[PDB]
C-alpha cells in the first residue's frame, strides 16, 4: 500500500464537482532516463519507511555536469508488493510528466531491467526543514538589504546564525516550486515542512518522502477510513468533502509557513485532532501568529487560510508577495541560480 500522494488533473467537469486524475499507469516511460546499475554505487540510509527506503548514493557518468554525482535512490522492500511495484514506476512516469524545475526534488534517472526498481533523484544535503529548523533554533537571530552582503551570502553554503531573511528565502522558495507544480495541473497533497528538503547552496526543494517514513509511527498523520490523512496541513474542504485542489494546497502552504516561521513547531500546539479540533476549524479557528513572523508574513497565513477555496492567492500571486519582502539583489540571485540550473548538463 504505497503511493506517491501527489495527482495530475487530466479535465475537471463543467460544473465543475467532478475532477479526472491521469492514471499515471497510463502514461509513457521514456527509457532514455535508464541508467546502468553497475554505474549506481549505494550508501548510507537516509530514511526508512514501512513499504521501501531512500538511500544515499554516488552515480558515475549519470551527469554531464557532475560525472561523479551524489544522488538519493529511491527503492522497495524485497518483499515487495506488486502493486507497490507499479506504484513506484507511476512516481517515475509522474515526474518525466511534469519535467524539472529548480525546487522540487528532481528525477535524475532510473534502473527498472534486471533487479529492484530503482529511482534516482537529486540529494538534498541538508536534509528536511523540520529537522534543520529544529537543529538551527538556538542560533536565530531576528535582525534585510542587499549592501549588507548578508543578502548574497542567502543562497550560498557560508555558515552564519539564521536570520529572517534566511525564513524569507525558504518561503519564496517554496512558493515558486508549488507555483510551477499548480501550472502543471499537479497537487502535491502532502504540503508540509517534513516535506520540504534543503539542498546545496540553501535550496529548497519540495517532494514526496514519504516513503522514507512509517505512516504508522507518525503522529502528523491521523487514521481516516483505512487511511492517514496529515489533518493538521489540510483545508476543510479536504477534510470534510474530501475535495484537493491547488486551492486546497495553498491553505497548506500557510500551515508550512506557520512552520517555518516557528522554527519548526507543531501546528495547534496542543491542540489534538478530535471531534472538538473538526468543529473549530470547521467554525473559523486558525492559528495565532507564530513568535517569529512578521506582521506581513502572518497576513500571507491567514490569506491562505480563507474558507473560501477561490478566495486564496494562487502561488503565482503568493511568489509575488513574498518577492517584495525581499531585497532587490536577492531576486537577482535567485534568477541567476535558476538559470544555472537549467544549464545543468
Sequence with gaps: RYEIRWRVIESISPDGHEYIYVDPMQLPYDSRW????????????????????????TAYGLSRSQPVMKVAVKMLKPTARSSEKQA?????????????????????GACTKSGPIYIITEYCFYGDLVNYLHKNRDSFLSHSMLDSEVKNLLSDDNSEGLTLLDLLSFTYQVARGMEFLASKNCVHRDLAARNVLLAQGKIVKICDFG????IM????????????LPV????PESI??????????????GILLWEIFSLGGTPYPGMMVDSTFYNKIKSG??????????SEVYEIMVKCWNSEP????????????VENLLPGQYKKSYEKIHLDFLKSD
Excluded: C, Q
Excluded at 507518525?218 to 487514521?223: F, I, L
Design 88 to 108: 513506484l514506476m507511476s512516481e517515475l512516469k509522474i515526474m518525466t510528466h511534469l519535467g524539472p524545475h529548480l525546487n522540487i526534488v528532481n528525477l535524475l
Design 217 to 228: 509511527h507518525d503522529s502528523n498523520y491521523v487514521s481516516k477510513g483505512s487511511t492517514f
Design 211 to 214: 516513503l522514507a517514513r512509517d
Design 310 to 321: 477561490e478566495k486564496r492567492p494562487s502561488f503565482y500571486h503568493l511568489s509575488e508577495i
Design 240 to 253: 470534510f468533502d474530501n475535495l484537493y485542489t491547488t486551492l486546497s494546497d495553498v491553505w497548506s502552504y
Design 232 to 235: 493538521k496541513w489540510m483545508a
Design 34 to 57: 535508464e541508467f546502468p546499475r553497475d554505474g549506481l554505487v549505494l550508501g548510507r540510509v537516509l530514511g526508512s519507511g514501512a513499504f521501501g527506503k531512500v538511500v544515499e548514493g
Design 285 to 294: 479557528y486558525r492559528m495565532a501568529k507564530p513568535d517569529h513572523a512578521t
